[model samples]
Target: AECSVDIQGNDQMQFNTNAITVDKSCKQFTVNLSHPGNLPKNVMGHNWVLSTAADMQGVVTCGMASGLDKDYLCPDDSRVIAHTKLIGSGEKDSVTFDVSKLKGGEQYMFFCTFPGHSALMKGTLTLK
Candidate 1:
């Protein structure tokens, strides 16, 4: 099976899937993020950022301080395993990360680092 996922964000601050499972057979994994809602980035921007469940809160805290200029993400933050670009209506972006970076038995979380969006736009990620 292909090692990638097609994800989307809506105007209501939500993602299409609440959970994602990665295939271990693949060397790399990709997340294709699309924003199909009718909203502007300044109002409802969204991005997919990956980190361990324990680091989720820390990432969100740092991201808010970083602001939109940096996709609400601090540059070179080691806690971030992988992430997609911030996007708005009709905007699309994607990112790929090495599968080896992921391991089983660890809890992972994928979320939107946009200002207050993470409160509702987040999900579980796992490798099996």
Candidate 2:
């Protein structure tokens, strides 16, 4: 896709891709996440969240305390640039954020905030 990406999440708690790059020319970028396995949202859920690498740990911890009512993420969290709703097998979700919000000199990152999923389900993003 020109300004979008399609990612996959499975029962194994993994994202199909680890890294993403966005062109500055794109006025907005979109991320589409899908679950292809047979697990329910509560058992093995996934959500795509965006933040700077520096805020990754903080965001993860905040989500833990925020609870599932808010999709495991704090409402209006400053660290989140974008995020898809928590989803499970056979479900899909997408998020679009303005490209201008992504600044340089900061290491942008994307991950799943489903409890311990971020440990291995995180990756980097770049703009140029």
Candidate 3:
């Protein structure tokens, strides 16, 4: 079966899994992100941001300037390959992106851009 991975994020700024592989034949890939903690969006929230590993730092740095209202992401940031809408406790968000965007051997990453969350809430993504 094609995989449908469920990753859990929390108020602590962490994702339950650090790596996931997407089947190359899957027409589209989905990431279902859930925040199981009870914190509010302003205080403790999370969003899944995807980009090439090389662009991760630039995206996060630029995103920081964009602030929370913009969901901590720079407006029209082309480097962002895919992203889920920011979600608070008990909330969940999912993003579907074309599998063609991912080529085997390309280093991809997913992270939460909510202020200081990037450090702990980051992961590597790959295509099989």
Candidate 4:
């Protein structure tokens, strides 16, 4: 099964898509994230982080403290189901994860932990 998706991030802290679907048949799923913005990572960086919606707050808070050196994600954060490295202008990153971890009907989401980007750079993940 095709378990790959391409998503674009912009300087405006927005993602091209607000939601993505994961097929249950996928043994492993991949998220290909690209940053189309011209700004540097220090300014407009973006990364894709997957976790339960209930965990977003603590995740983001801890991520903020972790800073960019850690890709704005807490080091070895088990709460993150999957994530891509922070990418800057014209750069790209991807992450692959086991599909079995995703349970159908449980609410999950993907977001950018680039400081304030979470406010606008978040989307739903539906596994069906």
Candidate 5:
């Protein structure tokens, strides 16, 4: 049951959930992202990016420079643990990653890297 989670992003720059738990038993975890708004991807796209809490700022900075052409993500950035493709209104994307990459004591973060979206579209992920 803990192998996957469904999250939502919307036109108002909000995510449906702020925290998620990954079960220790899961060898892999999946994140399904949905956008319920009606805006175009260029105007209000969203993506789910995972990284250590400390790496978040650097990732977001690089993502901004990467632009929409790359789904606002730095190409092949090692700091990124996992990510979903960018999606717009009424669209969806998913990302799966090996659970072993996560360490119990390290803080993990998930956020959207669409320019200014991170300020509002961020959350914490923890192992349980």
Candidate 6:
């Protein structure tokens, strides 16, 4: 069976986990995102995005142009490995990616791209 994990984003602009591990045995891995705060999406939206650590800044820069309508993510940006939709309080979203897409030892990062949120919402991901 595919493996999965749950991540929560709160109104305080934080994620519950700062790191994640994916076992090599899984063919696919899913990141389930939830927001438990009471703020609206426009005021305190959050999403989960994955990419190479080197590509993170570029992806975020491009996403700024994509805006909220596109879930604050760069449209068709190949650098993005996987991502969940922008969600707000009481909402949830998830994204699953093929484990083959990840290379062992490479640096992978996950973060929220809601403008200034990344400063506080970034984390590292690794294959175990």
lDDT of each: 0.94, 0.91, 0.89, 0.92, 0.95, 0.93
What's the true lDDT of residue 25 in model 4? Answer: 92
Which residue pairs collide, candidate 5?
A: none
The residue-by-residue lDDT of candidate 4 on 23-114, one tens digit each, is 89999999999998899999999999999999988898999989889989998889899999999999999899999999787899999999
Q: lDDT by residue for model 2 over 49-119, one digit each (tens)?
A: 99999999999999977877788899999789999999988999989999989987789999989899999
**Cα error of candidate 4 at position 49, Å:** 0.2
Q: Of 4 and 5, which scores higher on lDDT?
A: 5
Cα-lDDT of candidate 2 = 0.91
Please provide, for model 3 over 1-128, each residue's C-alpha lDDT reduced to its tens digit, 9 standing for 90 to 100: 47467899986777999998888888889999999999988888799999999999999999878888899999888899889978899999899988888867789999999888899999999888
The lDDT, on a scale of 0 to 1, for candidate 3 is 0.89
**lDDT rank order:** 5, 1, 6, 4, 2, 3
Q: Can you give the TM-score per candidate against the true fold?
A: 0.97, 0.96, 0.95, 0.97, 0.98, 0.96
**Candidate 1 vs candidate 4: which has greater lDDT?**
1
Model 5 TM-score on a 0 to 1 scale: 0.98
Best by lDDT: 5
Model 6 Cα lDDT, one tens digit per residue, 33-76: 99999998889999999999999999888887788999999888
With candidate 1 superimposed using the best TM-score fit, by how many Å does residue 5's alpha carbon deviate from the native?
0.8
Mark the regions of model 4 whose C-alpha exceeds 4 Å error after superposition: none
Q: What TM-score would candidate 2 get against the native? A: 0.96
